[PDB]
Amino acid sequence: SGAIYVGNYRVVNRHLATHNDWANLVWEDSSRDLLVSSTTAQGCDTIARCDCQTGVYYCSSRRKHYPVSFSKPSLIFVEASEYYPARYQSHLMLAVGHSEPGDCGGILRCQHGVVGIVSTGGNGLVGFADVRDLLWLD
Ligand SMILES: O=C(CN1CCCC1)c1ccccc1Cl
Ligand SMILES: [Zn+2]
């Protein structure tokens, strides 16, 4: 679990979005596994504006932050886990690291701020949904 809170926006994994998220829907993209909902209170996160390919992510299944190199956002086939199998996800970045069911919503950050949230994992890879192209979140 986990979310990004920037201005009056909450960014979550679309598949973890709550009733409240869908009641306050601003924007969702099935192909990116992202949903943005409106918040009453002000968020304190800043979104990175950069093409950083290094940063640090939070891994809840290890209670640890890991530094990683990660690929530029791309269209990628995500193999089966305990969710919908071999699905195509856009704006996805991969790194070598640990990701396990429950690690979704972990934030990936660089010196510029928030890059993305954990979305996929397995086989020693971690996938992050990029948010940096969503300039409107600012
Ligand atoms: O964190 C998740 C997604 N869900 C969050 C709560 C149940 C799982 C995940 C991470 C890595 C690999 C596969 C998955 Cl499903
Ligand atoms: Zn950066």
From Swiss-Prot:
<comment type="function">
    <text>Cysteine protease that cleaves viral polyprotein and specific host proteins. It is responsible for the autocatalytic cleavage between the P1 and P2 regions, which is the first cleavage occurring in the polyprotein. Also cleaves the host translation initiation factor EIF4G1, in order to shut down the capped cellular mRNA translation. Inhibits the host nucleus-cytoplasm protein and RNA trafficking by cleaving host members of the nuclear pores. Counteracts stress granule formation probably by antagonizing its assembly or promoting its dissassembly.</text>
</comment>
<feature type="binding site">
    <location>
        <position position="52"/>
    </location>
    <ligand>
        <name>Zn(2+) 1</name>
    </ligand>
</feature>
<feature type="active site" description="For protease 2A activity">
    <location>
        <position position="33"/>
    </location>
</feature>
<protein>
    <recommendedName>
        <fullName>Protease 2A</fullName>
    </recommendedName>
</protein>
<feature type="binding site">
    <location>
        <position position="112"/>
    </location>
    <ligand>
        <name>Zn(2+) 1</name>
    </ligand>
</feature>
<feature type="binding site">
    <location>
        <position position="50"/>
    </location>
    <ligand>
        <name>Zn(2+) 1</name>
    </ligand>
</feature>
<feature type="active site" description="For protease 2A activity">
    <location>
        <position position="104"/>
    </location>
</feature>
<comment type="subunit">
    <text>Homodimer.</text>
</comment>
<feature type="binding site">
    <location>
        <position position="110"/>
    </location>
    <ligand>
        <name>Zn(2+) 1</name>
    </ligand>
</feature>
<feature type="active site" description="For protease 2A activity">
    <location>
        <position position="15"/>
    </location>
</feature>
